[PDB]
């Protein structure tokens, strides 16, 4: 629930700098997990300019908001969306047809037969 009256969801945080320690403590309470892994997971959770419907990873890594799991999976790369649930949702989505800059996922090369270009 964290990764994907007051609760502690990840999307509620403004910047990842103040969001990492909470997740680090929460994980380290029971599982000894390195800070680098937590940073990688949170940075995977991130999104740059969510208003402009841009879903690729922010650079350098702070200039960008957070986003929920399903929107990131179904709005980042259709190749990665095919391996996750509800493929008809991104297939039947106007945004998927817009020529927007997108990130690359390994399943792309598996979504097609292996053609690089």
């Amino acid at each position: 629930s964290f990764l994907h009256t007051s609760k502690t969801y990840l999307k509620n945080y403004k910047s990842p700098i103040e969001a990492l320690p909470v997740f680090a403590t929460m994980a380290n309470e029971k599982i000894s997990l390195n800070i680098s892994h937590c940073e990688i997971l949170i940075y995977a959770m991130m999104i740059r300019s969510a208003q402009y419907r841009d879903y690729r990873l922010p650079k350098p890594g702070i200039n960008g908001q957070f986003e929920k799991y399903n929107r990131l999976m179904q709005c980042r790369s259709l190749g990665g969306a095919m391996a996750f649930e509800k493929q008809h949702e991104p297939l039947n989505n106007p945004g998927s047809f817009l020529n927007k800059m997108r990130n690359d996922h390994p399943y792309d090369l598996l979504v097609k037969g292996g053609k690089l270009r």
Binding site: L91, Y107, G113
Partner: protein
């Protein structure tokens, strides 16, 4: 602190009552133990447990056999495939039918009872039925018999009251390298003592579609399949039926072509080689005017069909006589009714009625149907699972010779080697108790064998035991020692043996068996560790806790530096013995090109399974895409999915001077990417919707 008091009965725990020391093992180990009891096949060499509880008596009492359900008079005895000498002679008779009459009833119900040479319930394991000699000889028409009379009982049921589930192995707890992780180290002799018997059935249909080949006969004599009591070829192959084509007559119907088996384009059923054939069941549709099988290749088929037809005709005649005698008073057992109906389905119908279109689960039947049932003895040498009647389950990871196994100074040879520390982790300590106690008891018996002028590890002859019994003094002394040991171990058994009529018989039985069998009940008032301390701190009854010498993997004969104790554990074999290995260089393909699953007829046609294993799932392809670049993973999945790529791989294997270390398997220039069937299907289906996934420009 009431440490020696157990407020439990054998009644509150059934299968857990099969062993004592149940409370010294963790509950997970006990549940696994009961499951392994459920999953254990029957071994040819069955022996009673050294430590006995009252449960084994009940479990032996309630087993599978051939029982007369009521006080009945045997009316008829019938036997398939009559035994003797002649032209159409049969070596062995599989099944005997007994038609009996349940008298002492107003109805006098007539029933049927089948006595086969075996009884099988698991898919590939069974057990031979040993017939009671005192009863089987008396089986005759017009004879008297009691209720619940036993015939053809399992070999696991002993002559006395006990059920044999496993084999007593002189286990040694050494942390040898052979027992890394969860394994066993076994010798050839003990594994010979544990050979499961496997009963299997092979079904082949030959009609207008195909005809049997010649695999068990010479040029002169045509034999499609082995006779009853025959042995399968060194390459286990039966039937090998070939499709019937007239235009290919001078090619695939010559005498050499019939004997020769083409692995492709022919249909064989491949069982265990060297497996003796138990029996054969033949079904024939005799009301087809053009017989699909050409003349010459229907000798054994007609032979066995004639024998079966005579058997079922005699059954039908018996029923007809009974009906003509007692119309409207012929209340019969349901099994007898079903047998008569099966006989009617077997025998041909009269010409005034349409013929029977026989089926087997929606599967049509054409002309000849052959069911060959055969038995084999599996030799365990690796990948065979074993359990120690506790939570400890393992796999045979090393098989050595009898000489190479650990041997004590007394001469006791180890049958198994187990890593001791596992007991410290899985927390199944009862084993050790058994182990420990067994050793002491064994040594005690051996001690008597040394004090009676006998030899250890050698069953004395009746003359030697008679000579030993000549003097009462030593017999009484040995019985007193046995009483003391029982008092140390089992006070209940101590009282029982105090109330003993003939101690000389007990001593003689102990000497003959070589081990004093111990009755250790579930509600046994024993402090276990107190008994262990008593055995350790005693001049007698103490097991020989000395050095043990064995042979390591380097061939040296090395003696262990610290004292090692050898003790009898009651082992048991499990199912999942292997034989399900599925290696397949190339797998047959669906019309939509992709490997598929194996149907029954097409899965029982290859030596070992030929399944296409899904070793690339979503998780596996995840790991590959991440560890290695997606390129090679896509190449592997393209070789598997695209049939042309797989054909290119096989062509590269075949057309290379070095089939190993091929420079490039598929020349991607000749076979470009994108030809994989699932991906092409997905892309085409999307294009039919008006969309297509393409790389960003």
């Amino acid at each position: 602190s009431q440490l020696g008091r157990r407020e439990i009965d054998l009644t509150l725990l059934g299968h857990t009552g099969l062993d004592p020391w149940y409370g010294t093992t963790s509950s997970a180990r006990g549940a696994m133990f009961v499951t392994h009891i459920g999953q254990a096949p029957e071994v040819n060499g069955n022996e009673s447990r050294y430590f006995l509880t009252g449960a084994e008596l009940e479990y032996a009492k309630y087993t599978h056999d051939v029982r007369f359900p009521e006080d009945c008079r045997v009316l008829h005895v019938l036997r398939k495939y009559p035994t003797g000498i002649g032209k159409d002679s049969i070596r062995s008779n599989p099944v005997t039918t007994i038609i009996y009459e349940n008298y002492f009833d107003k109805y006098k119900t007539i029933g049927v009872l089948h006595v086969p040479e075996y009884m099988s319930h698991h898919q590939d394991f069974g057990y031979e039925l040993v017939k009671n000699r005192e009863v089987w000889e008396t089986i005759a028409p017009n004879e008297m018999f009691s209720k619940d009379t036993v015939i053809a009982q399992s070999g696991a049921v002993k002559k006395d009251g006990t059920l044999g589930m496993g084999v007593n192995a002189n286990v040694v707890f050494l942390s040898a390298a052979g027992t890394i992780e969860d394994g066993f180290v076994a010798n050839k002799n003990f594994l010979k003592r544990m050979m499961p018997t496997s009963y299997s059935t092979a079904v082949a249909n030959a009609g207008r579609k195909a005809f049997f080949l010649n695999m068990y006969g010479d040029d002169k004599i045509y034999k499609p399949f082995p006779d009853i009591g025959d042995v399968i070829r060194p390459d286990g192959v039966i039937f090998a039926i070939r499709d019937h084509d007239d235009d290919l007559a001078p090619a695939e119907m010559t005498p050499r072509a019939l004997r020769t088996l083409d692995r492709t384009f022919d249909r064989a059923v491949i069982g265990t080689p060297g497996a003796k054939v138990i029996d054969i069941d033949i079904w024939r549709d005799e009301r087809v005017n053009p017989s699909p099988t050409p003349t010459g290749m229907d000798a054994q088929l007609v032979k066995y069909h004639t024998h079966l037809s005579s058997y079922y005709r005699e059954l039908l005649k018996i029923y007809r006589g009974l009906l003509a005698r007692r119309k409207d008073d012929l209340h019969i057992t349901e099994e007898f009714e079903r047998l008569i109906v099966t006989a009617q389905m077997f025998l041909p119908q009269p010409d005034n009625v349409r013929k029977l279109s026989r089926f087997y689960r929606l599967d049509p039947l054409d002309e000849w149907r052959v069911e060959v049932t055969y038995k084999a003895q599996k030799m365990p040498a690796g990948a065979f699972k074993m359990t120690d009647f506790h939570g400890g389950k393992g796999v045979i990871c090393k098989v050595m010779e009898d000489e190479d196994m650990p041997i004590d100074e007394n001469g006791n040879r180890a049958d198994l080697i187990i890593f001791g520390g596992s007991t410290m982790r899985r927390s199944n300590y009862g084993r050790i108790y058994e182990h420990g106690f067994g050793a002491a008891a064994r040594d005690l018996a051996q001690r008597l064998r040394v004090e009676a002028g006998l030899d250890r590890h050698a069953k004395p002859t009746q003359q030697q035991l008679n000579s030993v019994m000549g003097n009462t003094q030593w017999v009484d002394y040995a019985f007193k020692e046995l009483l003391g040991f029982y008092e140390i171990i089992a006070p209940t058994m101590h009282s029982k043996m105090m109330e003993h009529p003939n101690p000389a018989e007990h001593v003689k039985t102990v000497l003959m068996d070589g081990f004093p069998y111990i009755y250790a009940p579930v509600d046994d008032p024993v402090d276990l560790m107190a008994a262990v301390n008593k055995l350790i701190n005693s001049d007698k009854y103490r097991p020989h806790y000395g050095k043990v010498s064995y042979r390591d993997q380097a061939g040296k004969w090395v003696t262990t530096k610290d004292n090692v104790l050898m003790g009898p554990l009651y082992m048991m074999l499990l199912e999942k013995i292997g034989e399900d290995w599925s290696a397949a260089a190339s797998v047959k393909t669906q019309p939509f090109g992709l490997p598929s699953k194996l149907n029954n007829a097409d899965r029982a046609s290859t030596p070992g399974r030929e399944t296409a294993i899904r070793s690339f799932g979503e998780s596996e392809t995840r790991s590959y895409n991440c560890t290695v670049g997606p390129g090679p993973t896509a190449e592997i999945l393209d070789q598997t999915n695209n049939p042309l790529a797989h054909a290119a791989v096989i062509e590269s294997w075949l057309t290379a001077e070095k089939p190993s270390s091929v420079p490039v398997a598929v020349d991607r220039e000749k076979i470009p990417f994108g030809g994989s069937r699932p991906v092409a299907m997905f892309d085409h289906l999307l294009e039919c919707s008006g969309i297509a996934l393409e790389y960003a420009p």
